[PDB]
Amino acid sequence: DTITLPCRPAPPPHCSSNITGLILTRQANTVIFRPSGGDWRDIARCQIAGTVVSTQLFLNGSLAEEEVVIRSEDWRDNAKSICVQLATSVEIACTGAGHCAISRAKWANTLKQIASKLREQYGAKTIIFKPSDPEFVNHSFNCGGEFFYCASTQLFASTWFA
């Protein structure tokens, strides 16, 4: 019902943002994706972030018009990262007690929409999200000039069949 990510340090409740997108890195009818650890420069090539600076997930960025869209400089080269832009932003709510919470049902539908787009692009039936420096292995984001780190293993640890 709710996914509760542990965070360090405790992000204030007004640091809660909107997940407008993320960045993946591709590793049969089974293709595996992981949250990218590339530098914030590699984040820039997605061109869908807003003002906040964040790893693994795009907070407070731009949304797609109708449906989820995925872009890549080259789908053949796996070193190139996949830029996922959400159509409906998923809300991440920090409570100030050391955890930022996300609704499980909405992230599941988001992962299913992403899987459907990744299925059309790679022709595979099964899309698997596997977990990921500490700044890039975690969902790290800058709120109010202060940096935070959240364990994102709960977000990227699922499977999605056809």
Ligand X SMILES: *[C@@H]1O[C@H](CO)[C@@H](O)[C@H](O)[C@H]1NC(C)=O
32 or 69: CB nearest ligand X: 69
For the chain, the helix, strand and coil percentages under 3-state DSSP, each to the nearest 5: 20, 40, 40
- Cβ proximity to ligand X, 15 vs 128, nearer residue: 15
In the complex with ligand X, the residue whose CB is nearer, 129 or 141, is 141
CB neighbourhood size of 70 (10 A):
17
Question: Least distance in Å: CB of 143 to ligand X?
Answer: 4
Q: How far is the CB of 54 from ligand X (least distance, A)?
A: 7
3-state SS string over 14-70? HHCEEEEEEEEEECCCEEEEEECCCCHHHHHCCCCCCCCCECCEEECCCCCCCCCEE
Q: First CA to last CA across the chain, in angstroms? A: 23
Closest approach of ligand X to the CB of residue 61, in Å: 10
CB of residue 13 vs ligand X: minimum separation in angstroms? 9
Which is closer to ligand X, CB of 15 or CB of 111?
Answer: 15
Give contact residues for ligand X (rule: CB under 6 A). 14-18, 52, 59-60, 89, 91, 141, 143
